């Protein structure tokens, strides 16, 4: 069972996918057409997926929410995080816009309540120099 992060708007590119599952016996042509069709709802956000394989060299995959680090970048408008966090802070984020990432990530978080789940996203914030009001 492998993991990979593929942006929604790309199907059958050379770098990310080809060598990735090119050694597990999984057909590459049939997966990309299926993945692209399923992922055509976002079309602008990279969303990961896990290839749950069977011994028969078939693929079955369930899609995931776009990563928390990428999601929090557009909420602030800055294209990249702080090279030296806690000294240079790229932008500002209030407690309001954090909750939407909690809801979008609710299916991929082990937390129980929106209050506890909000602190998980706040942890990623200071790791990349983003202030939480």
């Amino acid at each position: 069972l492998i993991k990979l992060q593929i942006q929604a708007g790309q199907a059958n590119p050379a770098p990310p996918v080809g060598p990735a599952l090119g050694q597990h016996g999984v057909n590459i042509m049939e997966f990309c057409k299926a993945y692209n069709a399923a992922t055509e709802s976002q079309r602008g956000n990279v969303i990961p997926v896990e290839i749950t394989v069977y011994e028969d060299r078939s693929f079955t995959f369930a899609l995931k929410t776009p990563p928390a680090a990428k999601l929090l970048l557009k909420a602030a408008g800055v294209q990249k995080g702080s090279g030296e966090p806690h000294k240079t802070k790229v932008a500002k984020v209030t407690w309001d816009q954090v909750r939407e990432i909690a809801e979008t990530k609710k299916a991929d978080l082990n937390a129980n309540d929106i209050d506890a789940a909000a602190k998980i996203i706040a942890g990623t914030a200071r790791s990349m120099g983003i202030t939480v009001e």
């Binding site: 790309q10 199907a11 059958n12 590119p13 050379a14 770098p15 060598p19």
Partner: protein, 364 residues
Amino acid sequence: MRSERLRWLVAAEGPFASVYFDDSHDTLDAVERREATWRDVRKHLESRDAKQELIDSLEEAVRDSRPAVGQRGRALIATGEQVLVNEHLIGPPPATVIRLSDYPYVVPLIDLEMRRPTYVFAAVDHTGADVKLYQGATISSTKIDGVGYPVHKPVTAGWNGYGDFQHTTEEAIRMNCRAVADHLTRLVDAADPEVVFVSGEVRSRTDLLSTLPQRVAVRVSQLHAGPRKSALDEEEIWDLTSAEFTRRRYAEITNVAQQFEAEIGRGSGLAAQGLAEVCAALRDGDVDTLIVGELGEATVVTGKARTTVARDADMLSELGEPVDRVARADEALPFAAIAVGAALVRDDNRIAPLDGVGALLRYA
């Protein structure tokens, strides 16, 4: 050639003017050729509808250079808002080359380049020595002096041979040799030269070579020059070392040939030839060394990005992205090779690669 000096050339964007020509202000019927070539390139740029900024950025680069001695070529590469590449060449190109396109043309620079690595030139006699270190633009000079003054053994010894200047002169010469060896070892440890030319005589050049450690004694080329009182000029030193540097640069091509042949024979997958999979490997970023053959008029169709390239749009459509432009192979492939920080090697008609291109990879 490395991919460091041309790395910032990738960052620059805009139209690129690349001129390779002959700059030999030797004789009186040779200065005229300079402005003849200047007029030729001006009219070519006029015919290709170049922006004025290129021309008014080029005239001063052409006209403000102190003329190089003998027969030397000249290489220029500019964007219009600034100059980027401006050097002399070992030998003038057979044909004046002018190009105006978005991709710079750097193939003639791969071999023809008045730029050799750092090296040391030492003149030694068993009374001292003097050392010059070359790291490109800067030259450093040092004079090693001796502590044993009477390095000459007179015929006289004394009354019936009592007293003798055999050992007390050998020790002085050994002191001088030890001092020179220590200084040269310090220079080798600091600057890491590739060649240490030593010019002296049969006696005080083979005993200093026996004093140096194995670190430096492996990279020593022995010269045959004259006395230290005469002193040497830059032209003489250049002519002395050119013969060795020729063989040294030939050996690298030989070693690359051996690596390519071995990797092709094993069929492991660390070697690629022909555009078909060379372009794929270059796109994948795992190209370690690029060998440029006689590509000539072969064309490549690069997609949306300035880097991604493919042999034809028929197999580029497998990426989904559509074709954006068409460029010449010997003009776009080296660009992507520099982009992934690969080494560039100019074939000497001894590799015979398929389709006039080759690549040593980094993995499967």
